[PDB]
Design a protein around this ligand. Structure first.
Ligand code: HQK
Ligand code: SF4
Ligand code: SF4
Ligand code: SF4
Lengths: 353, 384, 180, 196, 166, 127
């Protein structure tokens, strides 16, 4: 944090609290929007009901969620059963503050972000491991091996693609040379839209984030119509809500980070407005991902693991090695533009056979 | 892992219990457990007049029920030699192919949803509503329609039925071709279905897997060609087949069956000429409703038929038909009374289900779901 | 065959921008066909005499056995049926009724004929045995509907619309094609 | 075609051939010759076993040899290697107090479930079965439903004020042995068949 | 704590439970397809709050008995009903569940109120999907405490509160 | 099969049932509470047929709130059956004209009929 200021600690607590409650209301209204967008996808229309726009159905759902007989299952672990949702939610909420929503002071005085750590992507990676932690831990705590195998699927698949995330994220560091997202964003301001340089890595990051609970491995897994998933099947009132909430926060965190790093996390060449462009790109990634949600099938966690290991990780490490060649020899930056354009043309033109 | 995929869970359509003998993520062998819906149609049917049992016939295989209706009608007719007018028979085959379309729509919606994505459940099922509207037009009922009769059909078609049906016959080919364009060049569904579900035709025959997945194993064995009953002798017909029994070839055959069924609908409706609707033999058909105020004999036959019914000769009978799930038939034993002595149903899904431990043997745990959905089971048929 | 993923995306979007297809019941009335199998009605002649002559054919031909008919003799001074016999008690258990149409097909006077209402859900078993004066053509609505019109002060609103009512339903009050 | 050869084989073996004018054929085999005959039947090429239907002839107006009668359905698929299309039935009577019958599990695995149903619905035990486990009826159910001496178990329909119906005493339709509400049944209601 | 002990709070939570009815899929028979058609793209039970469908019994309050309740499924359903959270409601869908239907025999429970506390009954064969919406609206105003029978009685919000389960 | 108690005497039938029951293990026994009029339990009368598997026990229509204090006896009865390990409770619905003659049929006919017609019941409705 060479060039970025520091708000007072009480302002840090205030901003963190506002971010948490914003994530709450946001994931609720985004559940509404996902329902209605799925509806538009499948002819059937959404809840023209309790709202008008349905925007009061989430409150009814939450009010039912409390008073919903939070039950302590017998034959189950007294402590971990209740404790795991706290992990899954807490270590999901965080890792969102780093994302820059504007230049300093564009928060009506103090700071668009919460924290601007020197080593950011490692923070995101570390707390990303803990979501899988909470998931499979809850899967175990139920004492139902039915859900246990689903929890194991969760951990196995998400961990494979979680490894792939590192080989994806290596490359842009060579260009930026710093591990703080804000320096990367200012770089994206100067040279412009980092993904133009590293589209393949972007893909292997994007696709990796598709495995991280967005959809299509979709062996996340959920109980529905298959070997039941973890983190559910025994929780009643709020803990189940806590798990769904944390998974959706992980979803929006990825859908915000992807524009942040590779594409233009805000930083717009046009109108350079602090918040609106970032929110719009987040919503765009949401529209595409929901398109995928209600448009693509599963990958069964077997073909998914084989695909992650044989395809994503070698490709990502190869791209890192190429970028390292260019950076270590440091003569051009244009060569990467040329090679990335060619790579994108390869991954695209190979389809229309 | 002797894992109990219990009844109805997880969302295992066709309430069923499965004891998956399994170590890991493969499938060693699944021990099925059925009987969770046995209501006793073969028993309760022994206590309803021949006219009434048409109310018991559709509700067993509740997806393609008109095969039940027509098979039972033909068995009883052959037992007492009633003559179905050509217009009645044509309407019967039209409704048969139409319920076939609805059945296959529901089957593929349920399958696609079973593992993978949810969306295409709607569009196909959407058409079902339109089709149901069509049925609601003629039978006044969505399904479980009580329309057919021993002599023929209950009553005539309204003028409003044909236009709605033509509208649907215009939209359906494009719709089905859209689904097929989505499906045939499958990105993952290829790597999901083509390999899975080993169906050696020898074993499918030994277990009698007639439900349209045998022709996926390359056996051209269909009653519509093997045993023509309802005029299929008079229809320009493609009988789809699959090269290797798997999920992919099964599904493609069923889709081409849907298109050919639409073609059969066009063919039958085009040849439609005015006429009568059922065998007027009073022992077989109740008196026309208009002369109830003219003749004593009218009142006698109406009263007796609607209280007692009629008494067919002593004898046993059977007629087979092709359901959306394979060979069907009724073994009907009549004792010369107003109620049948016994009614046994050859339940195609009941014998077809024996191929589950073999089929899902060695397949993956998730694929045990598709390999059930590929079979299209209806447990109202199985438990029965 | 990677193109199919893109094609799937495309068709899903095409249907996304295709907004319409649905009907929001109860806000929009369901279009029912004129032949629908609904709540039984007991019909009256133009003369005002009731059509049921209490012949127990609907009860005998009932494959679910939901029809009970206690008969009685017409009172010539104030007759109720057209013959010498009428139905003193006509109760039908909607929970037993499987909606065949055999009662209509056997009724020689056209008295008992299926109607159209389907909004008949109620809370208690013993309340779901609809009575004669709960199905006569004179009435407008189902039992919970009438009870809500009493406990609400709001008139009965039928949640269905049909192109027309059959001749066999002479008198049956329904929304007809929009003439009103 | 193989049906005609079954005919020329069995008729010399003294097996009666039951036929109605509808096109359905029954071949009655006794208990012993049944097993080896049908082993030969598969050896004759009878791939497909459609039905195994159990029958309780107790309440049939004319008497029959035995109470239970089990009927198998043998077919040859027209579209396979050598497809004739011959389909026919084999009936075998089974004693009331000796519900024995060897299974065709060794020939077809299809009779795995089917025979079990007859052991569920009838007191017939099929010898040589892999597992005779009750298929349809609840595990704690005692007896075999489809045999006439087993009650259907009807429950009255209910109405407002004490008014009820017991269907088995309500049904106006007559079975074969019920003479009817007049002194008797003759004519059409002792059997009626139109002549095409 | 049971959604009670303040005149406004009980109204509020009853409102929430009414429109937030989260169905627990229990498809039994041919009623099931006319149940699902109440969610197809002509007529969706996806507006009132029942879009999502948790097959788990640990997460859904409304149990739609859609089809004939065969006896071998009765005890299983029993535990499935007890495997629901206590704020749960039970609708009996179809004739075969509400009544014995036409299947008056040894095989079927002639009224599902025997094993599970029924909230709402719905005749029909099959009940038109819009009749299923009408039944859930009936249940809606019941759990709000706005429902009266033919005898004038107000019905409790949650049936299955009054049974000494065990 | 034994017959203990008498019609419309809940307390006498109950105490005789306590005495004759003893320490019988009901792990696989079956309890049929036969009644009339499926719906109206508010005035219902109940008879009991207990099939232990090795011997059976009959109590006529002497339980239920239709008799004064019959519900309290029925409560103690279901609590007793639940204590001894019963899990399977059944209710059979017969016509009032049936209930009285049924107790005069031979054991085989009565027992076969009842086990055939039984409806699985939640015992909670009688507590
Ligand atoms: C999510 C929805 C509501 C669509 C859903 C609800 C319930 C189920 C499981 S009940 C069920 C479903 N389909 N079938 C057929 C006839 C298609 C085989 C059955 O026999 C049974 Cl019993 C599945 C999906
Ligand atoms: S429609 Fe209803 S009342 Fe009429 S015969 Fe059928 S079950 Fe009986
Ligand atoms: S059939 Fe018609 S006239 Fe006869 S009793 Fe029934 S309603 Fe009355
Ligand atoms: S009421 Fe009709 S549709 Fe529903 S389960 Fe019974 S037979 Fe099927």
């Amino acid at each position: 944090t060479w060039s970025y200021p520091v708000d007072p600690y009480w302002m840090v607590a205030l901003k963190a609290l506002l971010v948490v409650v914003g994530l709450l209301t946001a994931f609720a209204f985004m559940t509404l929007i996902e329902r209605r967008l799925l509806a538009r996808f499948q002819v059937r229309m959404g809840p023209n009901r309790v709202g008008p726009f349905g925007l009061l159905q989430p409150l009814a759902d939450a009010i039912k969620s409390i008073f919903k007989e939070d039950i302590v299952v017998a034959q189950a672990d007294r402590f971990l059963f209740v404790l795991a949702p706290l992990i899954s939610v807490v270590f999901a909420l965080l890792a969102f503050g780093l994302i820059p929503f504007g230049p300093p002071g564009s928060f009506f005085g103090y700071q668009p972000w919460v924290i601007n750590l020197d080593l950011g992507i490692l923070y995101l990676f570390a707390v990303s491991e803990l979501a899988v932690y909470g998931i499979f831990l809850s899967g175990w705590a139920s004492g139902s091996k039915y859900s246990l195998l689903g929890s194991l699927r969760s951990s196995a698949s998400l961990i494979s693609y979680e490894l792939g995330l590192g080989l994806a994220l290596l490359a842009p560091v060579l260009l930026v040379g710093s591990l703080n997202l804000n320096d990367i964003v200012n770089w994206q301001k100067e040279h412009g839209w980092l993904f133009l340089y590293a589209f393949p890595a972007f893909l292997v990051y994007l696709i990796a984030s598709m495995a991280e609970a967005a959809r299509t491995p979709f062996d996340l897994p959920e109980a529905e119509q298959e070997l039941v998933g973890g983190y559910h099947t025994e929780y009643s009132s709020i803990k189940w809500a806590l798990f769904q909430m944390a998974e959706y926060i992980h979803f929006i965190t990825a859908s915000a980070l992807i524009p942040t790093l590779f594409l233009g996390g805000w930083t717009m060449p046009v109108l350079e407005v602090p918040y609106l462009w970032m929110f719009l790109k987040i919503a765009f990634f949401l529209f595409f991902f929901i398109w995928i949600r209600a448009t693509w099938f599963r990958l069964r966690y077997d073909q998914l693991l084989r695909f992650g290991w044989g395809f994503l990780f070698p490709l990502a490490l190869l791209w890192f090695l190429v970028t390292a060649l260019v950076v270590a020899l440091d003569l051009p930056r244009t060569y990467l533009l040329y090679l990335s354009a060619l790579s994108f043309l390869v991954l695209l033109g190979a389809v229309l056979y | 892992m002797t894992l109990n995929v219990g009844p109805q869970h997880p969302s295992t359509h066709g309430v069923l219990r499965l004891m998956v003998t399994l170590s890991g993520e493969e499938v060693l062998e699944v021990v099925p457990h059925i009987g969770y819906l046995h209501t006793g149609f073969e028993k309760t049917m022994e206590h309803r007049t021949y006219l009434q049992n048409i109310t018991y016939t559709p509700r067993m295989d509740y997806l393609h029920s008109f095969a039940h209706d027509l098979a039972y009608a033909l068995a009883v007719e052959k037992l007492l030699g009633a003559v179905v007018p050509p217009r009645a028979e044509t309407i019967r085959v039209i409704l048969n192919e139409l319920s076939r379309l609805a059945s296959h729509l529901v089957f593929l919606g349920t399958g696609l949803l079973d593992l993978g994505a949810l969306t295409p459940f709607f569009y196909a099922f959407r058409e079902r509503e339109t089709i149901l509207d069509l049925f609601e037009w003629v039978t006044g009922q969505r399904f479980h329609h009580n329309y057919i009769r021993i002599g023929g059909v209950k009553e005539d078609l309204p003028e409003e039925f044909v236009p709605e049906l033509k509208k649907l016959l215009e939209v359906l080919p494009h719709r089905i071709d859209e689904y097929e364009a989505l499906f045939a060049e499958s990105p993952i569904f290829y790597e999901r279905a083509r390999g899975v579900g080993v169906i050696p035709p020898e074993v499918a025959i030994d277990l009698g897997l007639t439900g349209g997945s045998l022709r996926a194993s390359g056996v051209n064995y269909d009653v519509r060609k093997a045993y023509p009953y309802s005029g299929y002798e008079t229809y320009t017909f493609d009988v789809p087949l699959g090269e290797r029994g798997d999920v992919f070839d099964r599904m493609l055959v069923r889709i081409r069956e849907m298109r050919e069924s639409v073609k059969i609908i066009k063919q039958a409706l085009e040849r439609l000429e005015p006429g009568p609707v059922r065998d007027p033999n009073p022992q077989i058909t109740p008196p026309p409703r208009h002369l109830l105020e003219t003749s004593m004999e009218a009142v006698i036959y109406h009263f007796k038929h609607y209280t007692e019914g009629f008494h067919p000769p002593k004898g046993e009978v059977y007629v087979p038909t092709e359901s959306a799930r394979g060979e069907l038939g009724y073994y009907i034993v009549s004792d010369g009374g107003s109620m049948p002595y016994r009614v046994k149903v050859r339940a195609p899904s009941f014998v077809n289900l024996q191929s589950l431990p073999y089929a899902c043997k060695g397949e993956q745990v998730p694929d045990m779901v598709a390999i059930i959905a590929s079979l299209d089971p209806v447990m109202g048929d199985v438990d029965r | 065959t990677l193109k199919a993923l893109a094609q799937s995306l495309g068709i899903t979007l095409k249907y996304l921008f295709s907004k319409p297809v649905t009907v929001p019941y109860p806000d929009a009335p369901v279009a029912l066909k004129p032949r629908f199998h609904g709540r039984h009605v007991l019909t009256r002649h133009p003369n005002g005499l009731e059509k049921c002559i209490g012949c127990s054919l609907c009860a005998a031909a009932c494959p679910a056995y939901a029809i009970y008919v206690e008969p009685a003799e017409n009172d010539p001074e104030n007759p109720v049926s057209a013959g010498e016999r009428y139905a003193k008690v006509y109760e039908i258990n909607m929970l037993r009724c499987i909606f065949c149409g055999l009662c209509e097909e056997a009724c020689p006077t056209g008295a008992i004929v299926l109607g159209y209402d389907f909004e008949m859900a109620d809370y208690e078993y013993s309340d779901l045995v609809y009575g004669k004066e709960d199905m006569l053509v004179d009435v407008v609505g189902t039992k919970p509907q009438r009870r809500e019109a009493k406990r609400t002060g709001k008139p009965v609103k039928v949640g269905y619309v049909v192109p027309y009512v059959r001749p066999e339903l002479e008198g049956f009050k329904a929304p007809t094609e929009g003439g009103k | 075609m193989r049906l005609e050869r079954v005919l020329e084989e069995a008729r010399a073996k003294g097996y009666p051939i039951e036929d109605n004018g509808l096109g359905n054929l029954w071949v009655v085999l006794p208990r012993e010759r049944f097993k080896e005959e049908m082993a030969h039947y598969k050896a004759m090429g009878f791939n497909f076993l459609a039905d195994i239907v159990g029958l309780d002839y107790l309440t049939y107006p004319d008497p029959r040899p035995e109470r239970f009668a089990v009927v198998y359905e043998l077919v040859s698929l027209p579209g396979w290697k050598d497809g004739d299309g011959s389909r026919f039935f084999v009936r075998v009577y089974v004693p009331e107090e000796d519900p024995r019958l060897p299974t065709v599990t060794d020939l077809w695995g299809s009779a795995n479930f089917l025979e079990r149903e007859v052991y569920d619905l009838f007191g017939i035990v099929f010898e040589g079965h892999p597992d005779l486990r009750k298929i349809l009826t609840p595990e704690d159910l005692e007896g075999h439903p489809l045999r006439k001496d087993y009650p259907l178990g009807e429950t009255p329909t209910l109405f407002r004020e004490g008014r009820y119906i017991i269907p088995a005493e309500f049904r106006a339709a007559l079975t074969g042995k019920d003479p009817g509400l007049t002194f008797y049944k003759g004519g059409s209601r002792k059997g009626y068949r139109s002549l095409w | 704590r049971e959604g009670i002990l303040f005149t406004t709070l009980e109204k509020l939570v009853a409102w929430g439970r009414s429109n937030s009815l989260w169905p627990a899929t229990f498809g039994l028979a041919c009623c099931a397809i006319e149940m699902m058609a109440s969610t197809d793209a002509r007529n969706d039970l996806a507006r009132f709050g029942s879009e999502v469908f948790r097959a788990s019994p640990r997460q859904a309050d409304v149990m739609i008995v859609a089809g004939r309740l065969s006896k071998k499924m009765a005890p299983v359903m029993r535990r499935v009903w007890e495997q629901m959270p206590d704020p749960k409601w039970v609708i009996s869908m179809g004739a075969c569940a509400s009544s014995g239907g036409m299947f008056n025999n040894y095989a079927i429970v002639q009224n599902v109120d025997s094993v599970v506390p029924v909230d709402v009954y719905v005749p029909g064969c099959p009940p038109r999907p819009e009749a299923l919406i009408y039944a859930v609206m009936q249940l809606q105003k019941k759990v709000r405490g706005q429902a009266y029978n033919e005898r004038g009685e107000r019905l409790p919000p949650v049936a299955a509160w009054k049974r000494t389960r065990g | 099969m034994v017959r203990v108690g008498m019609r419309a005497a809940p307390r006498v039938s109950l105490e005789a049932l306590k005495a004759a029951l003893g320490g019988l293990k009901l792990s696989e026994a079956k309890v049929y509470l036969i009644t009339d009029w499926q719906d109206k339990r508010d005035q219902a009368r109940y008879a009991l047929l207990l099939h232990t598997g090795k011997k059976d026990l009959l109590v006529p229509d002497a339980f239920g709130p239709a008799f004064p204090g019959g519900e309290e006896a029925l409560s103690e009865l279901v609590g007793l059956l639940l204590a001894q390990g019963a899990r399977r409770f059944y209710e059979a619905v017969v016509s009032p004209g049936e209930m009285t003659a049924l107790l005069d049929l031979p054991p085989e006919e009565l027992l076969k009929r009842v086990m055939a017609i039984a409806n699985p019941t939640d015992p909670g409705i009688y507590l």
